[PDB]
Design a protein around this ligand. Structure first.
Ligand SMILES: CNc1ncc2cc(-c3cc(C(F)(F)F)ccc3Cl)c(=O)n(CCCCN)c2n1
Length: 273
């Protein structure tokens, strides 16, 4: 990792220790701080995140500019993504993109995830809230925090309803549980940030999934896209596509965009006579 001198960094606005938007000697950056009195574990997790990010060089993975580790407070400095987190972005831009644009976002995320998987990195917390969007509509995987627990664990919280059954039931997180999560992200994108499973409780979601229920088709969703997210949600990991398969399929759909005009039937929850 590049060590950056503090005189080269100006913090400006809190966008999230805190996360600031700032300027780096000038390019816009995001800046994550570690406050005084941090523990050894905090330091290893914090610098650990920078270490992992520094190992990656891919269009669809947030780029590390560098770290401040020789001076306090310590900082991680990344590229700045002008449109912020994908979940909030979709919800504030409801209906404003083409289906081709939405599918192109998902291709970008899948390409990032394929790279992570092949670099032997399991994300464990893939969700639209952990994807960032730039002014070219490029989606990039973010959140490489080391210290993550599944929420509601008897023994950062990973939410149940984005997580694959095997990861919940016996703590088996793999690139195949990340594919499950990616299927949920597909549904988030195609619904402009609808909350998966609505007001169902965690227990209700888990029971539904184990009984074979799956999220219904988004409105105006290409048949091929719904089929692909459904395959991501196979109970049996071996029947899920790999990210390599997902990228291949999305690339084919984008290159033959009339393929996306065939829509999955939408089951209307209310009909009007
Ligand atoms: C709004 N635009 C914007 N642009 C770029 C970033 C980069 C980071 C980031 C990510 C990592 C790592 F590792 F997780 F990828 C590390 C360090 C940083 Cl600074 C970040 O935390 N935020 C804030 C997200 C708030 C959304 N809940 C960003 N926000």
């Amino acid at each position: 990792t590049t060590e950056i001198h503090p005189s080269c960094v100006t913090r400006q606005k809190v966008i999230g220790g805190e996360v600031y938007k700032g300027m780096l000697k000038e390019v816009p950056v995001a800046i994550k701080t570690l406050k005084a009195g941090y523990t050894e574990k905090q330091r290893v997790d914090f610098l650990g995140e920078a270490g992992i990010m520094g190992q990656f060089s891919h269009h669809n993975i947030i780029r590390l500019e560098g770290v401040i580790s020789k001076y306090k407070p310590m900082m991680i400095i990344t590229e700045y993504m002008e449109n912020g987190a994908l979940d909030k972005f979709l919800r504030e831009k409801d209906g404003e993109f083409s289906v081709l644009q939405l599918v192109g976002m998902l291709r970008g995320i899948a390409a990032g995830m394929k790279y992570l998987a092949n670099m032997n990195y399991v994300h464990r917390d893939l969700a639209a809230r952990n994807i960032l969007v730039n002014s070219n509509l490029v989606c990039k995987v973010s959140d490489f925090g080391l210290s993550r627990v599944l929420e509601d664990d008897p023994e950062g919280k990973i939410p149940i309803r984005w997580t694959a059954p095997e990861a919940i039931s016996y703590r088996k997180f793999t690139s195949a549980s990340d594919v499950w999560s990616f299927g949920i992200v597909m549904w988030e994108v195609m619904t402009y940030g609808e909350r998966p499973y609505w007001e169902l409780s965690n227990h209700e979601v888990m029971k539904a999934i184990n009984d074979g229920f799956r999220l219904p088709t988004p409105m105006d969703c290409p048949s091929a896209i719904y089929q692909l997210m459904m395959q991501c949600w196979q109970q049996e990991r071996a029947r899920r596509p790999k990210f390599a398969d997902i990228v291949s399929i999305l690339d084919k759909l984008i290159r033959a965009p009339d393929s996306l005009k065939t829509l999955a039937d939408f089951d209307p929850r209310v009909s009007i006579r």
